[PDB]
Design a protein around this ligand. Structure first.
Ligand code: A1H9S
Length: 165
């Protein structure tokens, strides 16, 4: 059945004040079926608040829209982000124990986004692996996709993954 609506929504910040529900829809419909599309406006002046939301029919359509950034809507580059579950590019990965290596984390996480840093944590005194790591991506959407999954399995371990600093 249908993925939860919260996971199919994109907040679109930085809109041109001239963007309307119709022009926002016409833009974002290029990447999927939109079940909802709203420009936030002042209740008295009707002047745009400079942000809005679009809701796609599926998560894969959200991915397609995010993969097509940068989006220029009505002449202005906007800022799409998945709805809340801050905006960061780094994750903590725990529960990897002592047998998990860089390539294990790379091979798994590279399908969420472009990796810039993998840091497998070792003990300051002994050099032994401590069983957690940090992965830094080039962009926040990778992290946003990662942290909404219920499960992450890497090197046979069920991992705890959260946003880092
Ligand atoms: O490479 C990294 N190593 C460690 C990190 N943890 C943040 C340290 C901290 C967390 C909570 C309170 C105070 C300090 C990090 O973000 N990146």
């Amino acid at each position: 059945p249908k993925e939860p609506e919260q996971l199919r929504k994109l907040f679109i910040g930085g809109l041109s004040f001239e963007t309307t529900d119709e022009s926002l829809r016409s833009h974002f419909e290029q990447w999927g079926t939109l079940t909802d599309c709203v420009v936030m406006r002042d209740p008295n002046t009707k002047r745009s608040r400079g942000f809005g939301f679009v809701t796609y029919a599926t998560v894969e359509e959200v991915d397609a829209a995010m993969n097509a950034r940068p989006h220029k809507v009505d002449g202005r580059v906007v800022e799409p982000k998945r709805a809340v579950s801050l905006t960061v590019k780094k994750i903590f990965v725990g529960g990897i124990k002592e047998d998990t290596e860089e390539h294990h984390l790379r091979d798994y996480f590279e399908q969420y986004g472009k990796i810039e840093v993998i840091e497998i944590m070792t003990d300051r005194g002994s050099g032994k692996k401590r069983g957690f790591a940090f992965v830094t991506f080039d962009d926040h959407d990778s992290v946003d996709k990662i942290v909404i999954q219920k499960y992450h399995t890497v090197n046979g371990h069920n991992c705890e993954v959260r946003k880092a600093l």
